[PDB]
Amino acid sequence: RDKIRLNNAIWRAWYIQYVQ
């Protein structure tokens, strides 16, 4: 369950770093 939250955080994080 904390896995899904961690998985989501890492997937959403790539875009913020990729476009900045």
Next chain:
Amino acid sequence: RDKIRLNNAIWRAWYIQYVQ
């Protein structure tokens, strides 16, 4: 490196399981 040892140890362990 410590992961590589974990992968080998877990991979080698499965055979004991299926052989017993």
Next chain:
Amino acid sequence: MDKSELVQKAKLAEQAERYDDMAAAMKAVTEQGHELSNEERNLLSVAYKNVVGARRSSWRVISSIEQKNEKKQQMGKEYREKIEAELQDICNDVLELLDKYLIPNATQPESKVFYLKMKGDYFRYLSEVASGDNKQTTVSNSQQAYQEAFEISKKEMQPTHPIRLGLALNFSVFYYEILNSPEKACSLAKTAFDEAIAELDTLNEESYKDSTLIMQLLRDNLTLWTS
């Protein structure tokens, strides 16, 4: 017979982490014309999310490598475009499945929001790698599928329904990552979260764990997009 066999093969494939096998079996179940049960619907969605996700993940790795040697950059483009071609084949199969079977054979409002959100999702995945006129087409179809699913959900589901919540989570991601609008994203997410919290009495024994989890994911997305 063949349906029950296919569902078992899909279950075995998922255990064996052979998600292409799992999507193939669940594709056959869908193509048999009948409306998918809730277990079948989940199996199909999990299978293709793993199948498309592997190529999305590979695409992202190559994309970062491309940005980070004339001949090397030329090669990075070709390997990325190879992955992009794979991405489109996967999405087009899934979107075909939706438009010929899942969506039209969907009878109850809940399934319709589920499959319309799926259509928006897979049109969104196309938009992540699309270009030119194709991108503007995918973006329009994605946004339109999400919006239609969103209107049905506001009219038929409680704000804590996991399908309604997960639809809002992805629709906000669509505004953040596909359109360049962090404010709508944050705006949609908070509203969604706030309505669910305002109606915490609607939580049901069957999915309160799922409802709260997606509520938390909306919150996590909100923290990431403002911190």
Next chain:
Amino acid sequence: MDKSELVQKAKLAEQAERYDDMAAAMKAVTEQGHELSNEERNLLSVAYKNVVGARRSSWRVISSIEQKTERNEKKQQMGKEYREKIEAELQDICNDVLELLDKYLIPNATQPESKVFYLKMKGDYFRYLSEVASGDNKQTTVSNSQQAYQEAFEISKKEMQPTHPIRLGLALNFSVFYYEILNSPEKACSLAKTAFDEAIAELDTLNEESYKDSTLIMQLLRDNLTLWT
């Protein structure tokens, strides 16, 4: 295409974890007839070990599901059919590797490291075949593995010091062959022990470009040894 292009494609494939693409690029490089450099040989080896490894794990999962099907329903038959599908994929992959080894890699080099490397490689993939083979095919796969391992074993003792990573890694896998394939724990523990003890008695032969690898395989030899006792 061109060799230099294919190696870059193989490198990109590994980063994207698309190892089926990675073996494909490296299989094409191998088929060009020229001797692979050490980086190319490593790129080929990592690719096929991931490719054959994916099916080995899947085969292991389905086999475990089978031996836990108390509910003796149609699931048992379906598990059998799905396991045999994975086994067929496994056999094709190993056969692709053994063809490459026997048509190009093993003949293309006369130095003892390449010979021990590629012979140990042949022993590995014949070992993978024996993990799922049965009947008249397994007795062919097994002794073929032992023969490739055995030849690589002889060359290694005569040209490499006990701390050479390829020589150590051959002893590690050959010892695994005795335990898992030949159901011979005493030799597996013995073979692994002598290889470790020989390297330890010869620690001064460690090299600046491999001590991290030599010691890593030494530690794995120990890990297998304790796990087996």
